[PDB]
């Protein structure tokens, strides 16, 4: 993989596209058990204005409901880790967020600091403008550097699907998986529309065809229990949302 030039990456990716069934089959996977939906949600607060007290409330809600993780910015990782000691709730830190165009050196510095502060997972933003230009060796090296700086993390790579064609989404899934990512993720929620059943079904189809163990996270605009069910049917194994309290409350009636 590390040997390949941009033309060799282009040929490899075209070969993977050639194995897919078209039109892409939609909603292939079983429904989730709704009473236990909390166990697959990353409970999120990323507003610039969010205060320490608001982060404390996010952490209390995650301990109460049993969400998979809380998801926060670098400067709140230490606070969240302290709050959640003794529980089974992890901490996810965002990396190169939301723009994705931060240098590789900056992304690596952030990843190292987050792990030192006790994070268990990292959600990094891909340099998606390079992806569109077919600067494939640059995209690959950017992800590999973060992967090697944080060997023990669950690593998720955000594509920003609102800015990409289907051909570009295929390329992004292949490069992320072969670099060692644990997940590919749809959206930041800060630049255009979020998860669709079409994009999640395509991402799942690509990942399942590869030899690696890469899973799919649906994010952006997930507001109701109906939204959660449809994204899992499309192939998602984790969900990003801020509305998890209202969603679980629905299921208890």
Dist CA 2 CA 144 (whole Å)? 9
The pair of structure tokens assigned to 243 is: 């509305």
Q: Please give the backbone phi and psi of residue 240, each rounded to the nearest 5 degrees, phi first.
A: -105, 130
Question: Distance (Å, rounded) from C-alpha 15 to C-alpha 134?
Answer: 16
Q: At what angle do helices 197-209 and 166-178 cross, to 10 degrees?
A: 40
> Is residue 108 within 8 Å of residue 100, measured between CB atoms?
no
Residues 244 and 36: beta-carbon distance below 8 Å: no
- Interatomic CA distance for residues 220 and 123, integer angstroms: 14
Task: Give burial (CB, 10 Å; 0-12/13-18/19+) of 101.
Answer: exposed
Q: Are the C-beta atoms of residues 114 and 149 closer than 8 Å to each other?
A: no
**CA–CA gap between residue 47 and residue 128 (Å, rounded):** 22
Q: Look up residue 187 and give its two tokens.
A: 């959206």
Check residue 96 and give left, alpha or beta (phi > 0: left; psi -120 to 50: alpha).
Answer: left
* Cβ atoms of 26 and 234 closer than 8 Å: yes
Catalytic residues: 123, 185, 217
Write the DSSP symbol of residue 185: E
Question: Which domains, and CATH codes, for the chain?
Answer: 1-253 (3.20.20.70)
């Amino acid at each position: 993989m590390s040997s390949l030039n941009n033309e060799e990456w282009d040929l490899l990716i075209s070969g993977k596209k050639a194995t897919l069934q078209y039109p892409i089959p939609l909603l292939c996977y079983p429904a989730p058990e709704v009473v236990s939906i909390a166990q697959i949600i990353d409970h999120t607060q990323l507003s610039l204005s969010a205060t320490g007290s608001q982060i404390d409330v996010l952490c209390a809600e995650a301990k109460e409901y049993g969400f998979a993780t809380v998801c926060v910015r670098p400067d709140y990782v230490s606070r969240a880790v302290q709050y959640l000691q003794g529980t089974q709730v992890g901490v996810t830190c965002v990396i190169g967020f939301h723009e994705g165009t931060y240098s590789t050196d900056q992304k690596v510095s952030e990843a190292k600091r987050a792990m030192q502060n006790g994070a268990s997972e990292l959600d990094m933003v891909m340099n998606y403008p390079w992806l569109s230009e077919k600067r494939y060796t640059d995209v690959f090296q950017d992800i590999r550097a973060v992967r090697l700086a944080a060997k023990d993390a669950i690593l998720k790579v955000i594509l920003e699907t609102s800015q990409l064609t289907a051909d570009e989404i295929i390329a992004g899934c292949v490069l992320s998986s072969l670099a060692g990512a644990d997940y590919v993720k749809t959206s930041t929620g800060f630049n255009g529309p979020g998860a669709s059943i079409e994009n999640v079904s395509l991402m799942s189809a690509v990942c399942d065809s590869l030899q690696s163990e890469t899973r799919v996270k649906a994010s952006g605009g997930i507001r109701t229990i109906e939204d959660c069910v449809k994204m899992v049917r499309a192939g998602a194994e984790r969900l990003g949302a801020s509305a998890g309290v209202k969603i679980v409350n629905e299921t208890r009636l």
